[PDB]
Amino acid sequence: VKPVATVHRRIPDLPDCDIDKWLNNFNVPSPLNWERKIFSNCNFNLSTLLRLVHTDSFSCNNFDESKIYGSCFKSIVLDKFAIPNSRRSDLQLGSSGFLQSSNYKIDTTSSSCQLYYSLPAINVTINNYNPSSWNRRYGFNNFNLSSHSVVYSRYCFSVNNTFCPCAKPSFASSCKSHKPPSASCPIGTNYRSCESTTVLDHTDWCRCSCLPDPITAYDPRSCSQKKSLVGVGEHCAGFGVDEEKCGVLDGSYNVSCLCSTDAFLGWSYDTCVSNNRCNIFSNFILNGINSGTTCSNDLLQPNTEVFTDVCVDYDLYGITGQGIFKEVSAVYYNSWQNLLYDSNGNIIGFKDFVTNKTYNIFPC
Ligand SMILES: *[C@@H]1O[C@H](CO)[C@@H](O)[C@H](O)[C@H]1NC(C)=O
Ligand SMILES: *[C@@H]1O[C@H](CO)[C@@H](O)[C@H](O)[C@H]1NC(C)=O
Ligand SMILES: *[C@@H]1O[C@H](CO)[C@@H](O)[C@H](O)[C@H]1NC(C)=O
Ligand SMILES: *[C@@H]1O[C@H](CO)[C@@H](O)[C@H](O)[C@H]1NC(C)=O
């Protein structure tokens, strides 16, 4: 861990981070659309936080929880979402289950903390939102689910930008066995790959890609929907679509390619409620311990001396460096700010808000 600077001063009068207000927002997202907020340049209270959110457990990975109190960080990145009851054990670090395979992957290499907390069910509305642009482009609008149902993807699929799930109407017009539904595809996209063959008294046997469906496809190589695990920081690339439910039977070029709601596969849902409260997960990424201006106010930080006449590493109102401090009477402090800069942008001076004393800073 990087050590705290020998001379450290925080910026005064920063706003409160209000992390608790964000965690307790009654509009709670599902892991499918996990929400992220970055907290910077503000003061937080971990002890207050753990009391104001009905905390069930809190632990840290690659970091000592007790070292948060009183510390400063460059930023604290929070990710949150409601927990479907059946998926709770997916959230163990390193788990290959559905939540981390296909919704939210917990970074295990960073310094992080996982908060398990809950909100009163009667005030919680779950926000289930499909984050995949391509799904939405071809007909996915909303979920139609019970209150407190929490969506999760089992399997995600990615497509490139020429993807269209509908068969070409000209191809479909001569199929006699297993005619696929068809429609016009957007300009700049390729029609679904389809083949007509003869076989045992079927003169016009039509088979297209992604059969029986993209999850169970015989030949994944010929299915343009490609399996994708979510990486750190990513959302589900998309539900797989049953391409036999995109387009309409005998649809011509006057119908735009559209998948029905039930064509989107490989997801499910569960309530987040137990003991009449919605259970919720939140991940804390702690960036840049012992630096920055995202600082805990849990402790009365006893301000140390400004060591003078000696090369010293410092962290002054967010700005780091090393130099030799020499106290000076106020008349020689040529500015009104708490820091003093030269022509090339380097700090040459400092005013201490704790003592109102002024100092020159020289290089070592
Ligand atoms: C939660 O909902 C109940 C009834 O709908 C209401 O009486 C209560 O004030 C709400 N709580 C909050 C914090 O809004
Ligand atoms: C939503 O689902 C319910 C069943 O839970 C059903 O009765 C209703 O018709 C559905 N509404 C729409 C718009 O699909
Ligand atoms: C998308 O993948 C298909 C694979 O069949 C390919 O034909 C097409 O050119 C690709 N499009 C782009 C933009 O890479
Ligand atoms: C943070 O906790 C300390 C210790 O109890 C307390 O004195 C201080 O008022 C708290 N500040 C906030 C903003 O909650």
Residue numbers in the entry: 311 to 674
Can you list sentences taken from the study reporting this PDB entry?
After removal of its 6xhis-tag, 1A-S310-677aa protein formed crystals in the C2221 space group with one molecule per asymmetric unit. The crystals diffracted to 1.9 Å resolution, and the structure of 1A-S310-677aa was solved using native single-wavelength anomalous diffraction (SAD) phasing. Accordingly, 16 data sets from two isomorphous crystals collected in multiple orientations were scaled and merged. The final dataset had an anomalous signal extending to ∼3.1 Å and its overall resolution was better than 2.3 Å (CC1/2 of highest-resolution shell: 89.4%). The overall structure of 1A-S310-677aa resembles the shape of a two-arm ‘boomerang’ with the core and SD-1 subdomains in one arm and the insertion loop in the other arm.
The human HKU1 coronavirus is a lineage A β-CoV and is comprised of three genotypes (A, B and C). While S1 is responsible for receptor binding and recognition, S2 possesses all fusion machinery required for membrane fusion.
